[PDB]
Amino acid sequence: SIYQGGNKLNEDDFRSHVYSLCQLDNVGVLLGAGASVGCGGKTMKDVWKSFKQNYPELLGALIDKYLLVSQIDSDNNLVNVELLIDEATKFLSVAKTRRCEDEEEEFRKILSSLYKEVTKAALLTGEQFREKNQGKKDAFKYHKELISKLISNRQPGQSAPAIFTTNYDLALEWAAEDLGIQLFNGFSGLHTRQFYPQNFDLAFRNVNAHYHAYLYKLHGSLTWYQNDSLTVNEVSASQAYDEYINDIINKDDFYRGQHLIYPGANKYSHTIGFVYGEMFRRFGEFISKPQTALFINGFGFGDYHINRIILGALLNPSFHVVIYYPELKEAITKVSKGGGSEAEKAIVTLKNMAFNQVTVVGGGSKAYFNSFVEHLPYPVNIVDELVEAIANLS
Amino acid sequence: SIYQGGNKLNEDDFRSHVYSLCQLDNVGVLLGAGASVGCGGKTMKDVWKSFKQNYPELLGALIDKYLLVSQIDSDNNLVNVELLIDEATKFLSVAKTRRCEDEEEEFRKILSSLYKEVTKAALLTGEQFREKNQGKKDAFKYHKELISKLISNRQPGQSAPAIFTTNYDLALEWAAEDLGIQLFNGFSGLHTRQFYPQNFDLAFRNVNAHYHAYLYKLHGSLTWYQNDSLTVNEVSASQAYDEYINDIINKDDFYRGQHLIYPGANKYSHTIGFVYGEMFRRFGEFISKPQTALFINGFGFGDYHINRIILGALLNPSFHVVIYYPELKEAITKVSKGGGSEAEKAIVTLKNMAFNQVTVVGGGSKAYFNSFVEHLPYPVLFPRNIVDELVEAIANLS
Amino acid sequence: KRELNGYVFISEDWRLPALGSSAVPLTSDFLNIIYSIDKEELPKAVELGVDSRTKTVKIFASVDKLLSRHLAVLGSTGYGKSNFNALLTRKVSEKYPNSRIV
Ligand SMILES: Nc1ncnc2c1ncn2[C@@H]1O[C@H](COP(=O)(O)OP(=O)(O)OC[C@H]2O[C@H](O)[C@H](O)[C@@H]2O)[C@@H](O)[C@H]1O
Numbered sequence A: 001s002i003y004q005g006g007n008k009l010n011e012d013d014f015r016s017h018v019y020s021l022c023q024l025d026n027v028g029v030l031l032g033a034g035a036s037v038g039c040g041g042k043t044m045k046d047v048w049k050s051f052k053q054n055y056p057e058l059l060g061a062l063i064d065k066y067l068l069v070s071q072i073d074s075d076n077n078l079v080n081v082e083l084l085i086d087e088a089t090k091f092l093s094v095a096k097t098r099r100c101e102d103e104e105e106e107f108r109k110i111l112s113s114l115y116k117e118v119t120k121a122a123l124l125t126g127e128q129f130r131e132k133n134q135g136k137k138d139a140f141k142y143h144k145e146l147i148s149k150l151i152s153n154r155q156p157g158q159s160a161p162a163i164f165t166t167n168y169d170l171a172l173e174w175a176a177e178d179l180g181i182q183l184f185n186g187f188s189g190l191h192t193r194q195f196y197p198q199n200f201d202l203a204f205r206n207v208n209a210h211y212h213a214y215l216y217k218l219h220g221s222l223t224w225y226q227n228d229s230l231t232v233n234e235v236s237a238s239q240a241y242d243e244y245i246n247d248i249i250n251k252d253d254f255y256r257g258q259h260l261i262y263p264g265a266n267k268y269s270h271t272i273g274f275v276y277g278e279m280f281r282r283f284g285e286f287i288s289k290p291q292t293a294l295f296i297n298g299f300g301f302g303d304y305h306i307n308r309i310i311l312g313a314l315l316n317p318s319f320h321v322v323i324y325y326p327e328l329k330e331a332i333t334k335v336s337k338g339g340g341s342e343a344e345k346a347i348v349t350l351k352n353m354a355f356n357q358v359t360v361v362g363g364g365s366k367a368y369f370n371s372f373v374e375h376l377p378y379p380v381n382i383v384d385e386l387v388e389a390i391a392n393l394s
Numbered sequence B: 001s002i003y004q005g006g007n008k009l010n011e012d013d014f015r016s017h018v019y020s021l022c023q024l025d026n027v028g029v030l031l032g033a034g035a036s037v038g039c040g041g042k043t044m045k046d047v048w049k050s051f052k053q054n055y056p057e058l059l060g061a062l063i064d065k066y067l068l069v070s071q072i073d074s075d076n077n078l079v080n081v082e083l084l085i086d087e088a089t090k091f092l093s094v095a096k097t098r099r100c101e102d103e104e105e106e107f108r109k110i111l112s113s114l115y116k117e118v119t120k121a122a123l124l125t126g127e128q129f130r131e132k133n134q135g136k137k138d139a140f141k142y143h144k145e146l147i148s149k150l151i152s153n154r155q156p157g158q159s160a161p162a163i164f165t166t167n168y169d170l171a172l173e174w175a176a177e178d179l180g181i182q183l184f185n186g187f188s189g190l191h192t193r194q195f196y197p198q199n200f201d202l203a204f205r206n207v208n209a210h211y212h213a214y215l216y217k218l219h220g221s222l223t224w225y226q227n228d229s230l231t232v233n234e235v236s237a238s239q240a241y242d243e244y245i246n247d248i249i250n251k252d253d254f255y256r257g258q259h260l261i262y263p264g265a266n267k268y269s270h271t272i273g274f275v276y277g278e279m280f281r282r283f284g285e286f287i288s289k290p291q292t293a294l295f296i297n298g299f300g301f302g303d304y305h306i307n308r309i310i311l312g313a314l315l316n317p318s319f320h321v322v323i324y325y326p327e328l329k330e331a332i333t334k335v336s337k338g339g340g341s342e343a344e345k346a347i348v349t350l351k352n353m354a355f356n357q358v359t360v361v362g363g364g365s366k367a368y369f370n371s372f373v374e375h376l377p378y379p380v381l382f383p384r385n386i387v388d389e390l391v392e393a394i395a396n397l398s
Numbered sequence C: 001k002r003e004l005n006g007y008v009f010i011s012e013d014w015r016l017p018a019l020g021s022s023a024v025p026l027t028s029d030f031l032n033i034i035y036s037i038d039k040e041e042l043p044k045a046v047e048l049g050v051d052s053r054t055k056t057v058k059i060f061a062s063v064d065k066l067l068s069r070h071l072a073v074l075g076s077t078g079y080g081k082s083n084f085n086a087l088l089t090r091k092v093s094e095k096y097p098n099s100r101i102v
């Protein structure tokens, strides 16, 4: 269940260890696409397997003529969607630049289907996505508790909590508005909202006598786009749905070009890559400070750069990491024969090394998100009666 | 085997005495040509043997005609090579000025043979002298230990250790570069490196809430030369090997004039003698400070000026010295019969004289460089790998 | 103190630490070193238990002082009196079957 260098642990000692590590100067959590399935999300391999069956005709071209997908991974559903989209975008640009009508019209069809597939599972509410106060729903009962536990555990006169994520949905932002706190995502403005990297160095205070957290998105969001002005903008959910989401989902053929920013596409341009570079640099800088604690869950360890930066950061003897991996049993069985994928080697190797600050969890299903939020320390509804008073007069 | 004040001493008391001497204000060491024997070097006797073996026809011109070497010293292999080189670099200049062709032509061959024989014994690695990361090998395992030991015994606010040597090889630089320590040797610049005598008075500090030492070379180095500019330049090993070392080692007759600075040859020019003068003056200035402790290892006590300077410094009541000498017994036996050489007489006179400031260690194989490093103390809280595993994991991570 | 390549333990109640000495917490390695016995009688010991504070240190005991002198056990009812006797007898039998216990 719980391993650290080769020994077991119980529930109480693990809780005490978690509480001890939640007191250092800097605390940050890294989240992946696996933590969004508990509220209506889908796994990437689910998207791939639902895509190849829906468009069997297109799957032949991706493998036979352009050599963009390996057949073995397609059988094993080991295809990375982000890299596929990023590499497919530049083919269309090259075809347009060289004026090849056949290749251009062929490529204009695959991207529409791919974007329809990827954006279908990111709504999390269906048609009701364009409504108000979505954070009051049942599915977001855990996110509010996690945010409240993270904020309330910080001592006075200390740094603000840091949150990292990879999913490009609004699930983690819906709870913030209903809770009543302020999240600085690097943007500022209402009528014409723009991007300012210096926004990450601000803090509130009371002139006559506190709620703020920092969020980074390493792969963008659904509300970010570049409207031909060579500048980045942000809009609301209703505005985005009225602008382009509805047409993409409903219409069969609707593609425009290098206009949307998700899930990490159009990196070739020198204007869009700025955001990704800034976010990655800020992520790298954070884990290089002394007295830091890092929590990882729902990450498949498939990103080579993240693994490399994590491994290289362990040379500091004051660096702590907590990692969850529900599929450690199949990993250890696979590595016993000296075989497996790169992710298998990455996850297994991090156990047979000599360092007492590295924690690995392989409890099969013990490493789920609702249990992870439960493990956080907590202290040991008054507006519930005014509803009747409001209903009295209407 | 261990004498101080004319009385024997055991191992534990000696080890406790050595530790107490490392807490003084000033600490310095002095090394000789014997300290590099375990890394692949040679002593002066081996050099003279090889020279008089490989070039037997040239000994006649040196002994019978120009009266540069005596037969008795030649037989016993007790010839001062650097003094011979210095004295030979003068006949050539006189002959060149006076316009005597045959004398000018003979000394070119003589000096070419001498340099070819003396240069080959200092590379320490052979053809891999021009490669990189030479400090990661296992032959330099004890120099790093010595450097780490001397640095970690200094409390904050105290001075930095100083190292003196009479070698002209790159062992200490290679050892120090691997550890991540910066040595000051009075040179600055990269594309044009020059000699500034005032650089010996600088130290580092941090402004973000570092570690260094000093190195004095009393006889020069292989990477120092002067090229028609009336100034001294320093280059890396690769440039020296590609410029003149390869020609020196692998050519029949190839000699140039006042170009090389080692082992103290061209002292008749006021531009070159400045470096030697400053290097020797700082040594004499160092040992005149109160509360000073000095270790000696690998020095043959064949020099007059160093002996005179060391003897004079004992008049102060706060100067302590520790000496190592493998051949104490033979020197004691030879002198008691009325014979012996100058070094043996000097060391016996030092041993006999009654002082608590002088310690002499002699045991044969117990007075070597490897044993000397062991006596200095490890701090208890010094940590001791995982870094190799991390580097291998990173390298294998595609 | 530090030895040539290892460490030994000697205690005399007349040496005291100097003033201004820094204070540090103790790791389990130093705890292991403190209870270490002479290198001559290492394989002549019997395991006893593990401390409750760290639960990572092994406590041994040489046979010489284990059984040369006499002994007595004091405690309340059922608190490791008969259990300890049975366990110690079993261990000394396992280490040396030649032993006799009545
Ligand atoms: N309900 C759950 N609760 C907690 N963890 C879960 C749950 N369901 C699954 N997991 C874990 O969630 C993880 C998902 O495994 P993988 O299939 O590799 O994830 P992905 O395909 O979505 O992409 C993974 C990342 O790769 C990309 O680069 C992005 O960074 C993505 O975030 C596993 O550990 C599951 O056990």
Ligand SMILES: Nc1ncnc2c1ncn2[C@@H]1O[C@H](COP(=O)(O)OP(=O)(O)OC[C@H]2O[C@H](O)[C@H](O)[C@@H]2O)[C@@H](O)[C@H]1O
Pocket (backbone or CB within 6 Å): B032, B033, B034, B035, B037, B038, B043, B044, B045, B082, B166, B297, B298, B299, B300, B301, B302, B303, B326, B367, B368, B369, B370
């Ligand atoms: N492994 C060893 N460790 C220590 N000492 C050793 C070792 N091997 C030999 N020895 C002894 O180390 C000594 C080496 O003697 P030499 O190299 O001729 O003396 P120098 O280096 O002073 O000669 C250069 C001098 O020339 C100028 O005039 C300056 O005076 C220079 O110092 C012998 O006793 C060896 O037995």
